[PDB]
Amino acid sequence: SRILLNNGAKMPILGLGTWKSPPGQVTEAVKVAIDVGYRHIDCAHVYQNENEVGVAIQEKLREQVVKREELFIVSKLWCTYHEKGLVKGACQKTLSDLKLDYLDLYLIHWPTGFKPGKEFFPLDESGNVVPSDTNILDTWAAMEELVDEGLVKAIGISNFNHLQVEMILNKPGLKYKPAVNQIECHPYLTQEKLIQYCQSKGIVVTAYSPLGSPDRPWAKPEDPSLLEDPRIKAIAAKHNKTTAQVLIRFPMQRNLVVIPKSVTPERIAENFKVFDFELSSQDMTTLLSYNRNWRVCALLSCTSHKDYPFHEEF
Numbered sequence: 511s512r513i514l515l516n517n518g519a520k521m522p523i524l525g526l527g528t529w530k531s532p533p534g535q536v537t538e539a540v541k542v543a544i545d546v547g548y549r550h551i552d553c554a555h556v557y558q559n560e561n562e563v564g565v566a567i568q569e570k571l572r573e574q575v576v577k578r579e580e581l582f583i584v585s586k587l588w589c590t591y592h593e594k595g596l597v598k599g600a601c602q603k604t605l606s607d608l609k610l611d612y613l614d615l616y617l618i619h620w621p622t623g624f625k626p627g628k629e630f631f632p633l634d635e636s637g638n639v640v641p642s643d644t645n646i647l648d649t650w651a652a653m654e655e656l657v658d659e660g661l662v663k664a665i666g667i668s669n670f671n672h673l674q675v676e677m678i679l680n681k682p683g684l685k686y687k688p689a690v691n692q693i694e695c696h697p698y699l700t701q702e703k704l705i706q707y708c709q710s711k712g713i714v715v716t717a718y719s720p721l722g723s724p725d726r727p728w729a730k731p732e733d734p735s736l737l738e739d740p741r742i743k744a745i746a747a748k749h750n751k752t753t754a755q756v757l758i759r760f761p762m763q764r765n766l767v768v769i770p771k772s773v774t775p776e777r778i779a780e781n782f783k784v785f786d787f788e789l790s791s792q793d794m795t796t797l798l799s800y801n802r803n804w805r806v807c808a809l810l811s812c813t814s815h816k817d818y819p820f821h822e823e824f
């Protein structure tokens with residue numbers, strides 16, 4: 511139920527996602543998650559709910575439901591904080607909100623640095639994102655310092671393409687390799703090339719939006735729906751499981767970590783009940799065959815950013 515990272519720590523392969531979890535609901539969601547067995551929570555400063563996630567974590571620690579060492583808490587450095595001198599403060603704000611004295615894993619959220627400031631998405635008057643002149647290798651060195659100062663146990667990356675991963679791996683004077691690359695992954699975006707690349711370098715992959723993020727705010731009614739794909743429903747029926755349970759088990763059997771999001775107690779519990787069955791080897795190849803290179807998480811305003819990750823094949 512845990513996977514070994516290249517920092518020597520073990521990471522639970524199932525975690526709770528928190529993007530779009532409303533601040534007034536996420537405390538209860540995280541409490542319920544911990545009660546039913548979740549030990550890994552995926553967070554981010556940009557999700558604007560870390561204070562409320564932290565309330566839940568703290569209550570369960572205080573209640574003696576779980577020990578801190580058994581929890582695996584992940585957060586992410588937002589794009590406006592890539593400048594080397596801003597990284598520590600960004601991490602400390604997240605630690606303060608989460609009410610923790612360390613993170614288990616801290617990720618560079620996107621490879622695209624944005625202009626520093628209060629706004630999370632600084633745009634020019636024509637709607638293009640305003641970049642920062644930061645070198646991601648300098649950002650990485652700042653992340654490495656967080657490990658040395660004890661603020662985080664592991665560091666990693668998210669939404670990095672293989673060339674960008676390679677840039678880090680080839681960084682002059684590299685001190686800590688990324689432990690994790692967290693990327694979008696599901697049957698319509700199977701990511702075989704990038705996953706094999708990362709795994710071959712000892713980097714663990716976390717699959718985000720495993721259900722296709724049906725609540726993403728930019729969703730359109732005509733968009734494909736994993737949860738309603740009759741082929742996936744058929745596999746679920748064979749196992750007497752839900753389609754969501756199949757979608758969660760799928761990345762687990764590829765040696766990935768997976769972080770489905772819910773604020774619905776029944777679904778939070780349902781999503782955790784994925785250790786009592788196995789997809790067959792043929793279920794796995796068949797689910798892989800559904801790849802469409804359909805990506806739900808990207809921003810048009812970032813497509814001209816020199817570090818936009820999704821122009822490359824992988």
Ligand SMILES: NC(=O)c1ccc[n+]([C@@H]2O[C@H](COP(=O)([O-])OP(=O)(O)OC[C@H]3O[C@@H](n4cnc5c(N)ncnc54)[C@H](OP(=O)(O)O)[C@@H]3O)[C@@H](O)[C@H]2O)c1
Pocket residue numbers: 526527528529530552553619668669692693717718719720721722723724725726737752754755769770771772773774777778780781807
């Ligand atoms: N690093 C990054 O750039 C990045 C990008 C995207 C996501 N992420 C992380 O990955 C997490 C998961 O991705 P996501 O939030 O995009 O989407 P997701 O986990 O694929 O799907 C979440 C949606 O599915 C619904 N749902 C959950 N369980 C269900 C079930 N058993 N049956 C039916 N519907 C169910 C949720 O509804 P309810 O909540 O209403 O129950 C919500 O609308 C995020 O929350 C975040 O932590 C990271």
Ligand SMILES: O=C(O)COc1ccc(-c2ccccc2)cc1C(=O)NCc1cccc([N+](=O)[O-])c1
Pocket residue numbers: 529554556557558589620622630807808809810812813815818819
């Ligand atoms: O980033 C996540 O974890 C989930 O997406 C969001 C999650 C949250 C929010 C958010 C929006 C407004 C206020 C606070 C948060 C946005 C977004 C969002 O659009 N993300 C896409 C994105 C981000 C950065 C760079 C690129 N890119 O280079 O293509 C794409």
